[PDB]
Every structure is written in structure tokens, then in C-alpha cells.
Design an enzyme around this catalytic site. Sequence first.
Site, mmCIF file in Angstrom:
data_model
loop_
_atom_site.group_PDB
_atom_site.id
_atom_site.type_symbol
_atom_site.label_atom_id
_atom_site.label_comp_id
_atom_site.label_asym_id
_atom_site.label_seq_id
_atom_site.Cartn_x
_atom_site.Cartn_y
_atom_site.Cartn_z
ATOM 1 N N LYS A 158 -5.178 -8.627 6.340
ATOM 2 C CA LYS A 158 -5.586 -9.209 5.097
ATOM 3 C C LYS A 158 -4.586 -10.271 4.835
ATOM 4 O O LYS A 158 -3.499 -10.258 5.442
ATOM 5 C CB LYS A 158 -5.681 -8.170 3.981
ATOM 6 C CG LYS A 158 -4.335 -7.695 3.456
ATOM 7 C CD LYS A 158 -4.500 -6.612 2.408
ATOM 8 C CE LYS A 158 -3.970 -5.292 2.902
ATOM 9 N NZ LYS A 158 -3.461 -4.475 1.774
ATOM 10 N N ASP A 187 -5.510 -2.781 8.915
ATOM 11 C CA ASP A 187 -5.578 -3.324 7.548
ATOM 12 C C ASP A 187 -5.169 -4.794 7.386
ATOM 13 O O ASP A 187 -4.394 -5.160 6.496
ATOM 14 C CB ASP A 187 -4.817 -2.414 6.573
ATOM 15 C CG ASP A 187 -5.116 -2.734 5.107
ATOM 16 O OD1 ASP A 187 -6.164 -3.335 4.816
ATOM 17 O OD2 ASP A 187 -4.287 -2.394 4.244
ATOM 18 N N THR A 242 0.835 -1.201 0.000
ATOM 19 C CA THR A 242 0.000 0.000 0.000
ATOM 20 C C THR A 242 0.874 1.257 0.000
ATOM 21 O O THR A 242 0.777 2.109 -0.897
ATOM 22 C CB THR A 242 -0.993 -0.018 1.194
ATOM 23 O OG1 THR A 242 -2.110 -0.855 0.878
ATOM 24 C CG2 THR A 242 -1.481 1.387 1.518
ATOM 25 N N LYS A 272 11.231 -2.549 2.766
ATOM 26 C CA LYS A 272 10.127 -1.782 2.196
ATOM 27 C C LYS A 272 10.513 -0.304 1.918
ATOM 28 O O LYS A 272 10.938 0.418 2.814
ATOM 29 C CB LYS A 272 8.906 -1.846 3.138
ATOM 30 C CG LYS A 272 7.617 -1.378 2.472
ATOM 31 C CD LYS A 272 6.505 -1.172 3.476
ATOM 32 C CE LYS A 272 5.156 -1.063 2.728
ATOM 33 N NZ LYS A 272 4.011 -0.705 3.616
ATOM 34 N N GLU A 301 12.581 -8.456 9.416
ATOM 35 C CA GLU A 301 12.696 -9.939 9.410
ATOM 36 C C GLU A 301 12.088 -10.510 8.095
ATOM 37 O O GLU A 301 10.937 -10.229 7.752
ATOM 38 C CB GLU A 301 11.877 -10.473 10.615
ATOM 39 C CG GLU A 301 11.768 -11.962 10.718
ATOM 40 C CD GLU A 301 10.892 -12.406 11.871
ATOM 41 O OE1 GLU A 301 11.165 -13.465 12.463
ATOM 42 O OE2 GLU A 301 9.973 -11.666 12.245
ATOM 43 N N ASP A 309 2.986 -5.150 7.984
ATOM 44 C CA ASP A 309 2.436 -4.037 7.180
ATOM 45 C C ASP A 309 1.348 -3.344 7.948
ATOM 46 O O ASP A 309 0.237 -3.144 7.438
ATOM 47 C CB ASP A 309 1.832 -4.555 5.876
ATOM 48 C CG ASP A 309 2.429 -3.894 4.665
ATOM 49 O OD1 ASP A 309 1.985 -4.188 3.533
ATOM 50 O OD2 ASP A 309 3.406 -3.150 4.840
HETATM 51 C C1 LIG Z 1 5.411 -5.997 4.390
HETATM 52 C C2 LIG Z 1 6.427 -6.817 5.110
HETATM 53 O O1 LIG Z 1 6.920 -6.456 6.164
HETATM 54 N N1 LIG Z 1 6.752 -7.989 4.529
HETATM 55 C C3 LIG Z 1 7.696 -8.895 4.985
HETATM 56 C C4 LIG Z 1 8.489 -8.833 6.092
HETATM 57 N N2 LIG Z 1 9.221 -9.938 6.097
HETATM 58 N N3 LIG Z 1 8.944 -10.717 5.030
HETATM 59 C C5 LIG Z 1 8.011 -10.094 4.360
HETATM 60 C C6 LIG Z 1 7.446 -10.688 3.125
HETATM 61 O O2 LIG Z 1 6.668 -10.065 2.420
HETATM 62 N N4 LIG Z 1 7.811 -11.954 2.852
HETATM 63 C C7 LIG Z 1 7.381 -12.728 1.785
HETATM 64 C C8 LIG Z 1 8.283 -13.535 1.095
HETATM 65 C C9 LIG Z 1 7.858 -14.299 0.026
HETATM 66 C C10 LIG Z 1 6.532 -14.260 -0.344
HETATM 67 F F1 LIG Z 1 6.123 -15.007 -1.384
HETATM 68 C C11 LIG Z 1 5.614 -13.474 0.327
HETATM 69 C C12 LIG Z 1 6.039 -12.705 1.394
#
Ligand SMILES: CC(=O)Nc1c[nH]nc1C(=O)Nc1ccc(F)cc1
Length: 274
Positions: free
Chosen positions: A121, A119, A14, A33, A73, A137
Amino acid sequence: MENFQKVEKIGEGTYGVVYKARNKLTGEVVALKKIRPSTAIREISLLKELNHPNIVKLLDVIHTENKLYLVFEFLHQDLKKFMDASALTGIPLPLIKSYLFQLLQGLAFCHSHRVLHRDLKPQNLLINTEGAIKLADFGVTLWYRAPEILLGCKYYSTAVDIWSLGCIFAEMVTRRALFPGDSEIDQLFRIFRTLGTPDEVVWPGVTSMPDYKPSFPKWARQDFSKVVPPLDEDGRSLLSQMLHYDPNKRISAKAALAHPFFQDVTKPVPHLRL
Ligand SMILES: CC(=O)Nc1c[nH]nc1C(=O)Nc1ccc(F)cc1
């Protein structure tokens, strides 16, 4: 960036893009991010101290070159992709129940520190090989949105997270999204058709909400037995309390943890193909 090699794009969040990346010092594999105020700075920095086993660890906030990066992480899979992957037989109930119980634990944590997610989901819900599930997130899908938000309440509470999680719960059980709105009104009206149009009986103050209209259609409630078969009576009782219209009647995470649905909880490992 810089001190981190992007290994791949893993999402278009987002508030920005998410990358798997590797720290050139630590050697460490992280989730990076890229975001896009001193106030965004101060609330973000409050996050770094919200530490819990069922919350993705915020490793570092890099405010630099006037950009915002959050270092997290790394987890290998989200719950949406695990759901699509599991659609044929569905997530085993002991797995669904462990997942729900841990998410309730994370939420019990945040909420006791006055933090709402806002949020939740399936895509923000991250899983590992050890059977863990974490919240990520923190606050275009409408599907997990509480109806007090949809009705224009501005000062809504931790009960919104409980609502989103019940929708996710139901979705894991039936292998279809409980309320797939494709607009705000469609979302609101889908909630209404399953649960009944709310009124002053079930929700004192609902007719005074900003976006409430007397002209809303007036649907009857369907029975839960039809909504989430084949959830057992405990599961259904709990789901019903997570989906109470009145946010003040809606069960807390802490109370939900004491529900008899968890009397037999366990921690199964999922079968994850990475
Ligand atoms: C938004 C966020 O903090 N995401 C993450 C934090 N650590 N790992 C993630 C993440 O999105 N990991 C993924 C790795 C592989 C995937 F297919 C999906 C999520």
C-alpha cells in the site's frame, strides 16, 4: 527504547507506532517501530536476512523488557504522501515506471525466498532522494487487497502482492485509487464492476471459494482504456496481467520485469521536498 531518542512520531502502523529516532551510540538516524511469541521472534529474525536494495533494511530486532522494537533504515518520505504532493501534474511516467520496476525487483527477491508481503500500500512504500523505492512493513485499508483474499482463500500466494502493486500502479497513473472499498463487500463489488464478476471461465474454482455467493451481482467488464487513461498500450497490457483474477494466471514479478513496458526503463530522480 532507551538507547534511542525519539525525534518524532512518523506513523501509527498496523502492528504499532513508528518513530524517527536517533541512536545515541552510532549517532545513526533510524526508523523505530514498537510492536503491539517465540514464533513472532523467529519469523522476524528471518526478515533480518532478507536483504535487498528495494527492501527497507531491518537494522536490528530488540526483544527487551519483554517488548518488541524493530530498527529500520530511515527513509524520508512514503509514496502516499508523494502522491498527494504530486496530484496536480501527477508523477511523471518515467518515474512511475522506475518505481514499478524496482518494486517488481524487491518482490522478485522476496518471492524467490517464499516471502510474501501481504499488505502492500502506498504508505508502506518508501522513497529517497536518489530515486529509490523500497518495500516496508511486511505483512485498515482494503483498497489493494487481492480478490482471492477477499473471497476467503486462506492459503493464498505471492500473486497477492502482484495484485496490490497493479492497484498502486494504476493509482499513480490516474491519480485516484483504482478500487477504494470501504467495506470488504464494497471492495469486492468495486473490483467486480471494473473487471467483471469472475466466473469459472476466467477463474476455475472461484464459485467454490469460501465467501463466494451465487447471488453476487453479475457485472460486465469495463475496458482498460477507460480504466487507466492515459497509460500506453504496454503499460495497459502489463497492468492487465497484474490484475488477472486467477492467481495462477496472474503474472509473476520476474516475468513482469521482462515485460516490454520496461524495455525503456530509466532511473529518474524525484523532486522531493523534505
Ligand atoms: C514501517 C517502516 O519500516 N518505516 C520506515 C523505515 N524507514 N523509514 C520508515 C518511514 O516510515 N519513513 C518515513 C519518514 C517520513 C515520512 F513522512 C514517511 C515515512
